[PDB]
């Protein structure tokens, strides 16, 4: 099992996903085609503020 | 859930288009046959029916 943490901005949150492009999911995180495995997101704005 | 589909998508992943055919092939009135021309019946003599 192999588990990943990190932090990112509201609109892309749904940005890190197989087929995806952009700035985060091609230049900082890359999940390929064939990842099994699923992602868990929730907001911190509390926190980090 | 959503299930699309890239061109870019390598083996494993690609569209498969799939059809089954199910037969119930038993001892009951035929309604399916194939090409196989009827032939006279006779009666009271060895054959391969």
Redesign the interface.
Known sequence: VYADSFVIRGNEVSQIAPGQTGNIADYNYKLPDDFTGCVIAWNSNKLDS | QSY?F?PT??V??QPYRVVVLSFELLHAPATVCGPKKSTNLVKNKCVNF
């Open positions: 699309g890239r998508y390598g494993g992943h």
